[PDB]
Structures are given as structure tokens and as C-alpha cells.
Amino acid sequence: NECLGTIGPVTPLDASDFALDIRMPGVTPKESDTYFCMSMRLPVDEEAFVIDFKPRASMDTVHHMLLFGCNMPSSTGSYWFCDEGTCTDKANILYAWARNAPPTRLPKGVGFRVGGETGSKYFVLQVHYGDISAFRDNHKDCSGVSVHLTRVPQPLIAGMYLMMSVDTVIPPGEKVVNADISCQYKMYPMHVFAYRVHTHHLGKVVSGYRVRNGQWTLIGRQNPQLPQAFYPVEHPVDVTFGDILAARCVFTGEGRTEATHIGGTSSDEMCNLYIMYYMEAKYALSFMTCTKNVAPDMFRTIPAEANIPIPV
């Protein structure tokens, strides 16, 4: 309503569905590269399924938008700067939009489970504004995302497998440092349909693989300095009990003056790989994580592909 929109925060869509319009409350970025966050509580207490998204991004300023599910947003204000945090509990990523990135429309019969016993009670929207022009000091923006929710159970439930490196340091000036992550998979099958990579400025490339009986199958690989949206996996990759998930983040220590710790508690660097999957609903869970390298020896046999740069 802060930009004269008539659409309420909740619109029923027929018997069992509703749309949630999650939009900035008329914010004003005053400096380039500004991340704003806001929260939106789920109007239902029982479980519901997020089945579609529609981005409502302003023409020019907005570069990137992320949507998370969590139970405790970092603030109770109408908005906040995301540098304060997104959620104080675990922020579960559900959606990314980057201008000019490939979209990732959820496959048919797939939804994220929210609400209920296990599910997230809030969405948190992050909106990244890039360079802003002079003379926009009193402009109000209501960028965001509309979310389609249904109470109809979906046969396939979407989730996120988060791979993160926390054991590796980049010594200053070392041209190439690899951070390797690996975990055994021990659940019912997941089918990986998209992925997103995240590092700070020293990242060169991030790759994730499923390894089964010694064979490596690419899930995805990208340069983390490109827009951190979800890139679609052209052919979804099935990951099953007894497979290993393996990732390698390639970094540089060039230009650095001190050691740079990857995944440190006061970061400086990170390597995160977000693997968006679906699972058959009655066996599904909504998130899984790997924060170690259980099979470091395996990375001697890694495909040469994983070391090839994906420039600029």
C-alpha cells in the first residue's frame, strides 16, 4: 500500500490455494550496493506447500532478490539492513531471482513444505539494490515476490542440501587454493534440479558432484562472482543411499596481505553450495547439510573439469 497497490498481503485463489504478496514497505536505498530485508509471516498455522513464485522487481535498481524460510527473522521492524542478519535461526533458501539469470520454475508436482510441525513460519525477503542514480533520495520502492501456496499435499517435496567448507585457510599470495567438501548420503533418494554457489571476492569456481562407486557425475559448476541465482540442472541428478556428495571451491590468495580463513566465524571468505532437490513426499525432508570432508583422498581422482576456470 506504500506504492498504492490494492492487493492485500493474502489473496485466496480458490478452495485450497492463496497468494502471498511479499513486498518492500516503500524503502529508499541511499547508497549503491544496499541489501534490504523484510519478513512475512505465514497466515496459516497448518502445513502448506509453496508451488510457484512471481518476481515483482523494479525496472532498474534491483539486481537480486532472495527468499528464505525460517522461524525467527532477525528483526521485527517493517524492514532492516540484511547486514544485521536475515534470520537468527537457520535461514532456509527457497528462491532466488537475478536480473538476466535463467529462471528456475519449480517442476510440476513439487512444492516446498512450510508451516505445520516442522515447517518454516516466516518468509524473509532480501532485495539487493545495485548502483543507484543520483536524485533518487526520496523514491519509494515496493519490490518483492508473490508466492503461490496450496494446502493440497504435493507428491514431491522440495528442499535444500547445503554444502559448506569450514576447515581451510588461504595463505596470502597462493595463486590456487582448493576447499573440498564431501559427505556420505544416507537418506531416501533426492533429485537435484538446481543449484547456487556462494563465496566472497576470492572465489573463482564452485563445482558439486555426486560420486557413486567411484564415478563422478556433475551436479553443477559456476563462477561465484556471477549473479548468485539458482541455475537449472539440465538433467536432474538422482542422489541415493551410499553416494557421496562432493564439492570443490577454487580460490585465489593473489593480492591478499594475510591468511584468509574460509567459513570462519567472522567470515572474510566462504564456500557454500546450495543444492535444490525434490524427494518423494513421505520420505522427504526439507533440509540437509554437509560441513566436512569425509573422503579427502577421493579428490585426487576428481574430473579435470572441476579445476577449469569459468571466467568473468
Numbering used by the authors: 45 to 356
Task: Quote the paper.
Two enzymes, peptidylglycine α-hydroxylating monooxygenase (PHM; EC 1.14.17.3) and peptidyl-α-hydroxyglycine α-amidating lyase (PAL; EC 4.3.2.5) working sequentially are the only proteins known to catalyze this reaction. PHM, a two Cu enzyme, catalyzes the stereospecific hydroxylation of the glycine Cα of peptidylglycine substrates. The two copper atoms in PHM, CuH, and CuM (located in the N- and C-subdomains, respectively), each use a single reducing equivalent from ascorbate to catalyze the reduction of molecular oxygen for the hydroxylation of the Cα of glycine at the carboxy-terminus of the peptide substrate. Crystallographic data on apo wild-type PHM and on several crystal forms of three CuH mutants (H107A, H108A, and H172A) presented here show that the copper ions are required not only for the catalytic steps but also for substrate binding and for locking the overall conformation of PHM in a configuration that is catalytically active.
As a step toward this goal, we have determined the structures of the apo-enzyme and three His variants at the H-center-H107A, H108A, and H172A, all without the addition to Cu2+ in the crystallization media. All of the PHM structures published to date contain two copper ions. As expected, there was no density for either of the two coppers—CuH or CuM. The final R-values are Rwork = 20.9% and Rfree = 27.3%. While loss of both coppers in the structure of apo PHM has no significant effect on the conformation of the molecule, mutations that cause loss of copper from a single site appear to have significant effects.
